[PDB]
Design an enzyme around this catalytic site. Structure first.
Site, PDB file in Angstrom:
ATOM      1  N   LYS A 179       0.849  -1.180   0.000  1.00  0.00           N
ATOM      2  CA  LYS A 179       0.000   0.000   0.000  1.00  0.00           C
ATOM      3  C   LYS A 179       0.889   1.236   0.000  1.00  0.00           C
ATOM      4  O   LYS A 179       2.094   1.158   0.252  1.00  0.00           O
ATOM      5  CB  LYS A 179      -0.953   0.013   1.201  1.00  0.00           C
ATOM      6  CG  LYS A 179      -0.282  -0.266   2.533  1.00  0.00           C
ATOM      7  CD  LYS A 179      -1.305  -0.351   3.652  1.00  0.00           C
ATOM      8  CE  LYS A 179      -2.332  -1.432   3.373  1.00  0.00           C
ATOM      9  NZ  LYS A 179      -3.351  -1.521   4.453  1.00  0.00           N
ATOM     10  N   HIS A 180       0.284   2.382  -0.301  1.00  0.00           N
ATOM     11  CA  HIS A 180       1.042   3.622  -0.401  1.00  0.00           C
ATOM     12  C   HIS A 180       1.745   3.929   0.914  1.00  0.00           C
ATOM     13  O   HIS A 180       1.139   3.870   1.988  1.00  0.00           O
ATOM     14  CB  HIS A 180       0.119   4.777  -0.786  1.00  0.00           C
ATOM     15  CG  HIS A 180      -0.767   4.478  -1.954  1.00  0.00           C
ATOM     16  ND1 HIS A 180      -1.940   3.764  -1.835  1.00  0.00           N
ATOM     17  CD2 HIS A 180      -0.651   4.797  -3.265  1.00  0.00           C
ATOM     18  CE1 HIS A 180      -2.508   3.656  -3.023  1.00  0.00           C
ATOM     19  NE2 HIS A 180      -1.747   4.273  -3.907  1.00  0.00           N
ATOM     20  N   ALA A 181       3.031   4.254   0.824  1.00  0.00           N
ATOM     21  CA  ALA A 181       3.805   4.565   2.012  1.00  0.00           C
ATOM     22  C   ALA A 181       3.360   5.896   2.608  1.00  0.00           C
ATOM     23  O   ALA A 181       2.857   6.784   1.914  1.00  0.00           O
ATOM     24  CB  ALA A 181       5.297   4.611   1.687  1.00  0.00           C
ATOM     25  N   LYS A 445       5.101  10.620  -3.091  1.00  0.00           N
ATOM     26  CA  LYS A 445       3.919  10.551  -3.942  1.00  0.00           C
ATOM     27  C   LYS A 445       2.924  11.667  -3.668  1.00  0.00           C
ATOM     28  O   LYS A 445       2.359  12.229  -4.609  1.00  0.00           O
ATOM     29  CB  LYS A 445       3.204   9.209  -3.773  1.00  0.00           C
ATOM     30  CG  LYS A 445       1.931   9.115  -4.603  1.00  0.00           C
ATOM     31  CD  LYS A 445       1.118   7.879  -4.282  1.00  0.00           C
ATOM     32  CE  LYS A 445      -0.040   7.727  -5.249  1.00  0.00           C
ATOM     33  NZ  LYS A 445      -0.962   8.891  -5.178  1.00  0.00           N
TER      34      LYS A 445
END
Ligand SMILES: *[C@@H]1O[C@H](CO)[C@@H](O[C@@H]2O[C@H](CO)[C@@H](O)[C@H](O)[C@H]2NC(C)=O)[C@H](O)[C@H]1NC(C)=O
Ligand SMILES: *[C@@H]1O[C@H](CO)[C@@H](O)[C@H](O)[C@H]1NC(C)=O
Ligand SMILES: *[C@@H]1O[C@H](CO)[C@@H](O)[C@H](O)[C@H]1NC(C)=O
Ligand SMILES: *[C@@H]1O[C@H](CO)[C@@H](O)[C@H](O)[C@H]1NC(C)=O
Ligand SMILES: *[C@@H]1O[C@H](CO)[C@@H](O)[C@H](O)[C@H]1NC(C)=O
Ligand SMILES: *[C@@H]1O[C@H](CO)[C@@H](O)[C@H](O)[C@H]1NC(C)=O
Ligand SMILES: *[C@@H]1O[C@H](CO)[C@@H](O)[C@H](O)[C@H]1NC(C)=O
Ligand SMILES: *[C@@H]1O[C@H](CO)[C@@H](O)[C@H](O)[C@H]1NC(C)=O
Lengths: 543, 542
Positions: A179-181, A445
């Site tokens: 999953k997105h950090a 991101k």
């Protein structure tokens, strides 16, 4: 008691009259304040220490501090790494010299190579199911008998990116690295959208130049591009606003920015720019002939526009002041940076979003909230990151230009790809040094930082370099299950976004808190989407 | 007020000194409902000071109040009032001069709003419709400067009308009882929408099939295409009739298999293959010839056999714990003597084959007859009846196709079919909707229901064939865009039923006006989306 990635911790105090308080801090923080975890009462009597359980996250690392509340002197400092489903009874005792002996009553359960065996069994079952499907197709063909090119590298790369995106959008097995950090750093789920944008820009160039070589009009292409971008934006705005649990979303709490909105905006910008500056493919040319260098020079105005936009991005991020916040901020706020900036998530990038679209219209659950305990609303698909999205889409367009100017010249294509990969890697290394958190512009991101774009572009160039000879030039393994989503990228994306909440894509689980069940559920759902893409590819209904 | 939507306050004052008063209630539209305790008002302790207690009687339609003294179970009074929405309706009971203790129940009203009208819909009729039309016109005018810089249309229009009505009634339809499925037997506006779609689906099956046969194609290619389309319809229906919006996602053993799209796909496959196996070329017509029946007597005999099978199973098959042949709503129905008998043999087959878990758990009778068992309307015998209705649609398509030259034979045949079907419906129902041999029912898909809605569909086709196709007065300007994207629009609003443009928070959650505005806006949005899809010449139709 314990749930998911939470190893219980037992603390016993063998001290005498120094009433103790423990503190916790995750290892992955750059600068987090030591948030309180649990208290420890004074020992009622000698030889009968008290106890106090806790629940420490065991995802990645753990820093334990035990500072007494009566006198601010740390009894001991522990930097142990807890394992999943552990016991970890911890004792604090004196030798004046306070010691901290940590024991492992129960060994932690292993995961991500039990889990390896489950994954192997699932893969074997999937292979058996694929063989059965092939047998069924052969039977159907026999019954019928009885009764009676994008180079495929772009397609395979888009398919890989989309399938990974689908897998990580279903939870990805709820693993910490799927999953997105939280803010800085790169994970597996942080690499799948930039590749999608890159390959989408490459597809834009390939399709547009094919159409312009064929019989068509520029204004018709402009109309098609505008209509497709508007449709993408509309569907994105519709689908990024479910009301599955809360009441129907009001007229103000609607979330405007989204993944599909960003895709539509970058598609429109890059496609209109390319239509404005589009020339027939030159026949500049035997041997390497590296002196040509026509792809870069033949499209200078686009490069000037991209450089101007990126200079604007850098100036806005590092120069534009923010009220009640240091200028040129890149941190996540919350408890990050010692909590001195409670409301600064994104700095100028988030300030612009809050000033234009308002606070209520942004993503109210940012990926940094889980770790940094931030409260401000931040949307990863914001406004200031569209500049970097456009930059990477144009990088994909340049990759397509290289791939198509040298129509059948493997040596030149490979040399250009490796040169671009090396240049982008060097730029990224210079920007971010080598530490994820440290550096000039750390890879991120939520801000779509320039280092993030350069790193992902270099990775995409390397993937194309390893895929083109295998898929097109030599035909080793022609991406058997991958280009079916490669042809119906947008349709499959919308499909899993809108069908994410139904029976076959997610069902009741016997073990709700377990990596194996979630992993074998998400894998089956992703394979179902691959099957649906294959079925739609058999009908030649590409859209 | 503090009341719920469509619920009238009922304040009760007691003037009795020796009897505890119990108030019973039963809506007028029950056939045989028991009386359930509504509220208990104790006797007045002090003379001259009545006891006060409040109840919220439903004001949907009809109301019957029976007052029973709990001391000796005797009759006190009996009202048959029709309450109003968000009313006050204070009620008092007292004796007449204390002469013979002939206590009476007099009803007084303090405030009563009025609904089921067009208070503000008239303003909304042209408030935004004109603006949207003008906005569309402005785009076309601007597009020309930027640019410079036959078909039936009647079957399609009818399909569009039916699809738009299904979309409207699937969003609530303003929460009115008109636009909602009736409790067991009975007809409403929302009960008329699906069988018309099945009828048009059958007619379009015949039209497309004969067109492709005249163009020239192998029968087995058509069979494969039909089978694959049916499988796709069934699959998407099974996917979409099981949303897991609840806290726990649907388990393996609690998935609801039957649905509307399952019915549509199964009937599609059955009737399309039936037509394929007996597809004869259309004769060259050259008035009083009954060719539409003698050219398809095999499948006509098959459909009659299917109807005989349905009747036999419904009226003869024994059921454990239920009478042999039942049609009752179930709970507190038929005076409550049959608690779990919903559907009789038409639901017992569902329970036996698909199991109790795999069925719809909130049937349309659970709101009025207070049933507890689960009965899916899209059962097994309902499939037979939907096949019969689709076959009648194929018959209508045959009539429209064979006599393609003159518009007199077509209208004569439509009116003859409409009269015959209406006569059959009147004979079966006896025009009472509660008694008769087979009352009109949507949950059971009654034969009288199919005949009635086939007669209605034939009359609609009779009025829409000349006006649209022949004389050209109308062309269904806003409605035939969904006509050629029925399946896509249905799946779309079934999956996009809950998102921001279609569902937004209301200023007041309980008011017919706001719900009507939201539902009309969503339906217009789907009309606009279908229009946009039609503009791009993207056509996916069953
Ligand atoms: C309410 O009171 C009425 C009248 O006393 C009851 O109606 C009678 O019920 C008995 C059964 O206990 C029947 O045998 C009679 O035929 C009924 N009608 C009469 C006596 O006129 C009724 O049962 C009571 N309870 C309810 C819920 O209505
Ligand atoms: C716990 O710490 C507090 C300090 O505020 C104080 O009550 C004491 O030092 C400790 N309690 C006991 C029972 O010793
Ligand atoms: C206990 O430990 C720190 C040392 O890093 C000390 O400075 C401070 O007084 C205590 N920390 C907290 C978070 O209370
Ligand atoms: C952890 O270890 C302690 C040591 O006595 C024991 O009491 C407790 O039950 C253990 N908990 C689990 C979950 O194994
Ligand atoms: C930060 O924002 C939260 C809500 O988002 C607010 O409650 C808090 O007061 C803010 N603090 C500062 C220092 O701006
Ligand atoms: C009947 O009413 C009297 C007085 O109103 C009360 O004391 C008694 O409990 C009531 N009995 C029942 C069964 O309601
Ligand atoms: C009904 O009228 C009474 C007075 O007759 C009043 O006290 C009560 O509040 C009214 N009910 C509502 C819901 O307003
Ligand atoms: C009807 O079904 C319900 C299901 O919960 C059951 O509890 C009840 O006992 C059934 N009725 C009879 C008469 O068995």
């Amino acid at each position: 008691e314990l749930k998911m990635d939470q190893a219980l911790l037992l603390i016993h105090n063998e001290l005498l009259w120094t009433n103790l308080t423990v503190y916790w801090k995750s290892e992955c923080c750059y600068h987090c304040l030591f948030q309180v975890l649990v208290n420890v009462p004074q020992s009622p009597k000698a030889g009968k220490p008290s106890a106090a359980a806790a629940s420490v996250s065991t995802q990645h690392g753990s820093i334990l501090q035990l500072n007494d509340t009566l006198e601010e002197k740390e009894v001991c400092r522990l930097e142990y790494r807890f394992g999943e489903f552990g016991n970890y009874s911890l004792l604090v005792k004196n030798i004046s010299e306070i010691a901290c002996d940590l024991a492992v009553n129960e060994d932690p359960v292993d995961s991500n190579l039990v889990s390896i065996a489950f994954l192997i069994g699932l893969a074997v079952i999937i292979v058996i199911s694929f063989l059965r499907l092939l047998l069924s197709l052969d039977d159907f063909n026999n019954w019928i008998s009885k009764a009676i090119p994008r180079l495929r590298s772009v397609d395979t790369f888009r398919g890989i990116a989309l399938i990974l995106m689908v897998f990580v959008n279903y939870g990805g097995g709820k693993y910490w690295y799927f999953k997105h950090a939280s803010w800085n750093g790169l994970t597996v789920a942080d690499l799948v959208f930039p590749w999608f944008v890159f390959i989408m820009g490459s597809s834009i160039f390939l399709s547009m130049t094919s159409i312009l070589q064929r019989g068509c009009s520029k204004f018709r292409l402009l109309g098609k591009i505008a209509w497709r971008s508007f449709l993408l934006i509309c569907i994105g705005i519709i689908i990024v606003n479910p009301n599955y649990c809360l009441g129907p979303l009001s007229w103000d709490k609607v979330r405007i920015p989204g993944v599909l909105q960003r895709l539509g905006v970058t598609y429109f910008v890059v496609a209109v720019l390319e239509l404005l500056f589009a020339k027939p493919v030159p026949e500049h040319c035997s041997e390497r002939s590296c002196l040509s260098l026509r792809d870069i020079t033949s499209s200078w105005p686009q490069w000037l526009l991209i450089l101007v936009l990126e200079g604007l991005w850098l100036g806005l991020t590092f120069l534009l002041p923010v009220p009640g916040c240091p200028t040129g901020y890149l941190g996540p706020g919350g408890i990050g940076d010692f909590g001195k900036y409670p409301n600064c998530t994104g700095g100028a990038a988030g300030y612009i979003d809050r000033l234009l679209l308002g606070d209520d219209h942004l993503y109210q659950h940012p990926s940094s909230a889980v770790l940094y305990h931030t409260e401000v609303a931040y949307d990863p698909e914001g406004i200031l990151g569209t500049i970097n999205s456009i930059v990477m889409a144009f990088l994909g367009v340049q990759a397509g230009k290289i791939l198509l100017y040298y129509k059948a010249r493997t040596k030149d294509i490979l040399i250009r790809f490796t040169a671009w990969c090396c240049i982008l890697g060097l730029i990224s290394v210079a920007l971010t040094k080598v530490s994820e958190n440290e550096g000039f512009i750390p890879v991120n991101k939520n801000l779509w930082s320039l280092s993030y774009v350069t790193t992902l572009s270099s990775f995409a160039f390397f993937i194309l370099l390893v895929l083109y000879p295998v898929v097109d030039v030599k035909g080793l393994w022609t991406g058997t299950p991958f280009f079916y989503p490669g042809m119906n990228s947008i349709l499959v994306y919308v499909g899993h976004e809108v069908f994410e909440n139904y029976f076959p894509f997610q069902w009741k689980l016997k073990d709700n808190q377990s990596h194996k069940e979630h992993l074998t559920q998400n894998i089956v759902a992703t394979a179902l989407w691959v099957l649906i893409a294959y079925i739609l590819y058999r009908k030649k209904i590409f859209w």
